[PDB]
Scaffold this motif. Structure first.
Motif, short mmCIF file in Angstrom:
data_model
loop_
_atom_site.label_atom_id
_atom_site.label_comp_id
_atom_site.label_asym_id
_atom_site.label_seq_id
_atom_site.Cartn_x
_atom_site.Cartn_y
_atom_site.Cartn_z
N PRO A 6 1.19 -1.02 -0.19
CA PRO A 6 -0.08 0.13 -0.08
C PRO A 6 0.68 1.19 -0.03
O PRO A 6 1.64 1.18 0.91
N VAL A 7 0.34 1.85 -1.05
CA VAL A 7 1.11 3.40 -0.99
C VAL A 7 0.15 4.26 -0.99
O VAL A 7 -1.42 4.67 -0.83
N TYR A 8 0.88 5.38 0.50
CA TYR A 8 0.32 6.81 1.40
C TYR A 8 0.84 7.87 0.74
O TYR A 8 2.14 8.28 1.33
N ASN A 9 0.17 9.40 -0.22
CA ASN A 9 1.13 10.39 -0.73
C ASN A 9 0.76 11.38 0.83
O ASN A 9 -0.22 11.50 1.06
N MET A 10 2.13 11.66 1.53
CA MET A 10 2.69 12.53 2.25
C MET A 10 2.43 13.89 1.91
O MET A 10 2.81 14.67 1.28
N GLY A 11 1.30 15.00 3.28
CA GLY A 11 1.74 16.35 2.64
C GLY A 11 2.14 16.64 3.78
O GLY A 11 3.07 18.27 3.53
N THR A 12 3.73 16.33 4.49
CA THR A 12 4.09 16.53 5.43
C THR A 12 5.79 15.88 6.45
O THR A 12 5.52 14.53 5.29
N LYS A 13 6.18 15.66 6.41
CA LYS A 13 7.57 15.63 6.82
C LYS A 13 7.16 14.50 7.77
O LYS A 13 6.99 12.98 7.65
N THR A 14 5.91 13.99 8.80
CA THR A 14 5.21 13.45 10.39
C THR A 14 4.60 13.39 10.03
O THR A 14 3.29 13.99 9.27
N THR A 15 3.83 11.88 9.99
CA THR A 15 2.40 11.18 9.66
C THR A 15 1.77 10.89 11.17
O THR A 15 2.91 9.58 11.11
N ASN A 16 1.53 10.32 11.43
CA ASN A 16 0.48 9.55 12.46
C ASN A 16 -0.57 8.72 12.07
O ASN A 16 -1.51 9.17 11.46
N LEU A 17 -0.18 7.34 12.29
CA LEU A 17 -1.05 6.32 11.87
C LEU A 17 -1.74 5.74 13.52
O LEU A 17 -0.50 4.92 13.79
N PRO A 18 -2.54 5.86 13.51
CA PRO A 18 -3.30 5.04 14.71
C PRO A 18 -3.60 3.61 14.16
O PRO A 18 -3.91 3.54 13.34
N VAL A 19 -3.43 2.64 15.44
CA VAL A 19 -3.44 1.30 15.30
C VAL A 19 -4.57 0.46 16.79
O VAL A 19 -4.07 0.93 17.82
N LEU A 20 -5.00 0.24 16.59
CA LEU A 20 -5.61 -0.77 17.55
C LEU A 20 -5.28 -1.28 18.45
O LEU A 20 -4.44 -2.48 17.61
N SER A 21 -5.10 -1.15 19.48
CA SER A 21 -3.62 -1.86 20.42
C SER A 21 -4.71 -3.41 21.06
O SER A 21 -4.19 -4.45 21.80
N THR A 22 -6.01 -3.02 21.65
CA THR A 22 -7.24 -3.66 22.79
C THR A 22 -8.20 -3.31 22.75
O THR A 22 -8.93 -2.61 22.46
N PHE A 23 -9.75 -4.46 22.33
CA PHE A 23 -10.54 -3.82 22.40
C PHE A 23 -12.23 -5.22 23.12
O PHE A 23 -11.30 -5.86 24.11
N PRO A 24 -13.16 -4.53 23.51
CA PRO A 24 -14.06 -4.80 24.01
C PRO A 24 -15.00 -6.57 23.64
O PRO A 24 -14.96 -6.82 23.21
#
Lengths: 53, 53
Positions: free
Chosen positions: A35-53
């Protein structure tokens, strides 16, 4: 006697062909396959799910 | 049992504002204050009366 190929040689041109040059640019096989993501600035934050109900 | 701001943190981006972003002010004053001469060459001579009888 005859006009030899060595006698006529100044009358004869060589040619040029590109068949052994590459026809197309390479690309990163990672860009081609993951997968390719086009970035707009030097750092991008990417959340990932860590634990769930 | 409660989620939290610390659990949810990766979902919560910060905003940006220009409200205090000011460019440098033009504080220069001698060219507006005093007589200006448009020089056409490196040096200009200004004759003056020095002594009189």
């Amino acid at each position: 006697a005859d006009t030899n190929r060595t006698d006529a040689a100044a009358l004869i041109q060589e040619a040029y062909s590109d068949v052994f040059l590459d026809s197309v640019s390479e690309t990163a096989k990672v860009i081609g396959t993951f997968p390719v993501y086009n970035m707009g600035t030097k750092t991008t934050n990417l959340p990932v799910l860590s634990t769930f109900p």
